[PDB]
Amino acid sequence: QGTLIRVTPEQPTHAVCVLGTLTQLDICSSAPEDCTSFSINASPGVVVDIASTWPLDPGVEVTLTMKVASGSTGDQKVQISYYPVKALLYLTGVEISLCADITRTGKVKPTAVKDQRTWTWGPCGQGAILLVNCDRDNLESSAMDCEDDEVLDSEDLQDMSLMTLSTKTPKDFFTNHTLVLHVARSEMDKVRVFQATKCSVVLGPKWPSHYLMVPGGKHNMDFYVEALAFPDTDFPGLITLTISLLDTSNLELPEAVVFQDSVVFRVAPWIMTPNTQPPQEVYACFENEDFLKSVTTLAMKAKCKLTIQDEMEIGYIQAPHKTLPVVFDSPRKRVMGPDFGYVTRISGLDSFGNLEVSPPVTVRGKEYPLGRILFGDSCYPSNDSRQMHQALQDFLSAQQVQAPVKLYSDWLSVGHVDEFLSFVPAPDRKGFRLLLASPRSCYKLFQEQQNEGHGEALLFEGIKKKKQQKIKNILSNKTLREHNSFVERCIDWNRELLKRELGLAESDIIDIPQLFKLKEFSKAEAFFPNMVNMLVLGKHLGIPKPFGPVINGRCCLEEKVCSLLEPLGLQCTFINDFFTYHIGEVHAGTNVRRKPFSFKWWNMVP
Amino acid sequence: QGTLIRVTPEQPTHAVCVLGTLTQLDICSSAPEDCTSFSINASPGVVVDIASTWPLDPGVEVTLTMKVASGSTGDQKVQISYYPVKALLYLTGVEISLCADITRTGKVKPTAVKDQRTWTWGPCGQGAILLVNCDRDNLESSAMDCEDDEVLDSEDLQDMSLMTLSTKTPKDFFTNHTLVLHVARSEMDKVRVFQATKCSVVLGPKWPSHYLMVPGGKHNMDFYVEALAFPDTDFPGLITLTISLLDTSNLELPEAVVFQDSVVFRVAPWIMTPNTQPPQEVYACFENEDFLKSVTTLAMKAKCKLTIQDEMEIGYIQAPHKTLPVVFDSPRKRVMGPDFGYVTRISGLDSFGNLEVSPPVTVRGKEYPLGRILFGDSCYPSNDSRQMHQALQDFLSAQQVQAPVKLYSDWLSVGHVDEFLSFVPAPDRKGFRLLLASPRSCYKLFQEQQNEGHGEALLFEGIKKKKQQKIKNILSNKTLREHNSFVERCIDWNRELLKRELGLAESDIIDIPQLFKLKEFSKAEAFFPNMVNMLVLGKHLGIPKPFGPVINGRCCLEEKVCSLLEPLGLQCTFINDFFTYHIGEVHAGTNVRRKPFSFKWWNMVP
Ligand SMILES: CCn1c(-c2nc3cc(C(=O)N4CCC[C@@H](N)C4)cc(OC)c3n2C)cc2cccnc21
Ligand SMILES: CCn1c(-c2nc3cc(C(=O)N4CCC[C@@H](N)C4)cc(OC)c3n2C)cc2cccnc21
Ligand SMILES: [Ca+2]
Ligand SMILES: [Ca+2]
Ligand SMILES: [Ca+2]
């Protein structure tokens, strides 16, 4: 933001000055050796702040400041007299300002002095936000918008960030000078820049620099910027665009740089939405025709739109100008469309049933207003242990805003985290509760009902293909009781893990009755349909119907589940067929889209 | 750091307790439904902090604390009585502490509570330091020490960090329990761990976990840790080792986790040394036999060891226990040895003449006590522009401690930064000065000597193969004067760049007389031997002899160079043949090793 000019008496000096930059003078280096003093006078447009004739000591600082842009080339003068011989200096005032939404308010602001071309997190920080163009507004084009080098629809401009170049110079100022917009060679494959007139490519992959065609006088120019890559292990998420003013008055000599200015964009990360957030839409996809009814009733009850899943997770990206949903598809078919993004980056833990996120929490000082991502892993790497692909773990950690927590889920047969934990909206305290499966909770009910005389109750009743099981001989099973004692020990481990990494007290956790049967390789499957895993649409739940032993009319499992959830204000609605069997895979067909956080992601300091 | 135990009246509960971890009791979950109150008594060794019989409300917190390690299994008891039915709890106190030099003092300290297994920069931060094993103490082995899986010499242990596992448990405690040391699967290729008895590999590449063989009783165990990779774009520089306590009492059931503890190591980065640092050794390598003399005189004068270069840079890595020099070799033969490291990670800007570092500076608040790395680059990427390989730039930025500054040097023919800038030790102010080549400085002398009557002086005098040039017709050359006006404009650009990124005033910069001749493709070579580039060994300089025009006995160029450097207290010693010509490459054979910073790198906060 500075420029040093050296004037000499033998030859007049011509210098360009950009409004907003400090300019100092070097009059000592080329001063007459017999001269011991000097004095300076200049035109009204030129202001001198030097710190009545001065003794030409090297320590003196001659500062120059120009009021406004020049109407002609060298229309401002500076006379330097030595003590006599005079030295001349012809100055031209020009305005070169590169502007972007650095205040994160939706409106473009010029370069303001506190930013210093550095991106900073927080409410008191500065830096523009750039979105990944990962959707498909153009209904005709089947590919992604960022895969080509053209702007097809006007609706696509809403997704791109705006950048303006306003210039006020003399008319004949551009016959010997030139402007060039450029980006680093490492960042060029992540960003593409358009010039609006009607849009053409100036910057992008294999095009790091481009000469600009501007006229003299007062002229502003609009640019539209798009991102082509999410933040990852090889891309922190910053893009820096730069304008440069070059002197080309010498035909034989290469171009000389006179002025540079930059703006720094940050690529918006992918953010998940917890169950506590309101649902915008419910997605569903031969069987369970009656369950489609029970599903449609719940959506109509919770006032949520329904349209006709475990392999994908619906997130979003947001900027001050645009906010749209983006679906992350597991590696284990892309739904691109208007305001619908898509991103893609093999073990059984790579599926997104193993991928969940907590409500906003505060853990021992650190605030997580966007919650924390939760995924499962082994307790320690062995030959027979599984883990989520490192490439996937890196992506989630690269998004930064939602600090991932590694849980233990390798004990389960499937290995997903959603099958032993869940979150529900609560009226008091934190505003939510943590639902954890509990064998101890399930056993207590069965033993209490055995003492109640109804120990002859047969489970699996009213089922087409199932074996009746009595409460009496279920409690008398020494094999099942040992396994559910081992499973409880696993959930207890994760219980204390979540209590520490989410800052949860026991008064925020609710134990839900559930027991498991050991499979081959000592893996764990649910003995009856997993109730802790469900469909949460606000105050309305959609728990799978447990089909537990009938006692005095209604199922005792549902009675306890309701007894724990009704005081929260949660309307329970048990579904006849939530999960379905294949061929040997148990799946669920429901998936939700929820309203993004009101909290802007760029305001937290990771 | 917690563990929740649930006792039941129908069956006694046995529980293991690690000294240092908080333990809470769950007596409500399995309490008799008819019971409304309870009371607890325990052995003297067990301490209860509950917050005179209690009403069994869920909100009550029963906390347990054990004084010391158990001498026998379940030698401490806890009786829980309900109101009556009693529930039992047999406890075993064990000590499992993993220790490392987390205080960065050279001595191993246990896990202290403020660390929380998180590495933190600064004097008030915590975290152990790990060095890359990139040297070769074993004189016989030709390869690097970290390339194999064995500890050959006792001298090699000084380079490795120490980690201890101290355990105090009952004797029969280990027949049903087991300990396992492990590291993440992503970090395993960067670290190798040895167990000392005599050393064997427990952890490393393709070996993420390993069972430990410890006896019962009071027993400590030593581990030696080495790093295998410097921090890069794919490795932030953190390693996390973890110990795990497993329960294996159930033969049929898989191992259950009871306790985990970790230590976090940070891999020490590569640090450069500026000219202001004292020189430990001078390296040199047919011709200029007389110059070897003038070189040996300077080293003997500055009291520095000499032994018989531009393609390599001598840096260092340091830890609280060991500090050794490491040579970074440019991609454009490895000198491994005892306490001599080696690291390696094609354009003409990839050479390390384009790689330099500044003295310790403070720039607008931010402190850089280890200086800042300086390398050259084009002003903007064009088809005909050059740049340092992105892989190289990433490595320097990954070292973090010395923030790299991108300068402009694409104008030069060679393109190196050392041929137009240098640093010298000063007595006052900052303690250093910045030496910049200056055509304006050189022209002023020549014009002043023309006025002095000695304008008939012929340059290139006393040279075997050279053409005589007079000061008169050198100043009268309109071609040379335009080119040195363009070169000055380049150095002036970098001048303001360094003033802003190093926080330098004009009172810290010294202009050195020098001019250049344009070559093909408008590139720049020095017209006479570059003086700003030299050999700085403390107060003693080794400037190349300019062979400038002779005036009244001595060379006027040397007279001005001395006039600027002598007041600093710098003894100038001009060398007859500093640079040599090949075939078309101009090189220098000298290279220096300097004393590392007293400032420990882990104390600054990047
Ligand atoms: C109704 C099915 N069923 C179950 C049952 N319910 C499960 C739910 C999940 C689960 O939560 N997920 C499924 C995988 C993907 C995860 N994202 C979510 C996983 C399971 O085991 C693999 C489940 N099992 C065995 C038990 C049962 C007993 C009788 C009749 N039917 C029964
Ligand atoms: C004595 C040679 N010489 C020079 C001269 N001196 C140079 C030094 C460097 C330099 O600083 N480096 C060399 C490259 C690697 C960098 N790390 C450091 C680079 C140069 O041009 C490429 C130099 N030229 C042309 C000019 C001259 C005139 C007459 C007789 N001899 C003359
Ligand atoms: Ca497009
Ligand atoms: Ca779009
Ligand atoms: Ca859109």
Ligand SMILES: [Ca+2]
């Ligand atoms: Ca999920």
Ligand SMILES: [Ca+2]
């Ligand atoms: Ca070795």
Ligand SMILES: [Ca+2]
């Ligand atoms: Ca070694």
Ligand SMILES: [Ca+2]
């Ligand atoms: Ca050594």
Ligand SMILES: [Ca+2]
């Ligand atoms: Ca160098």
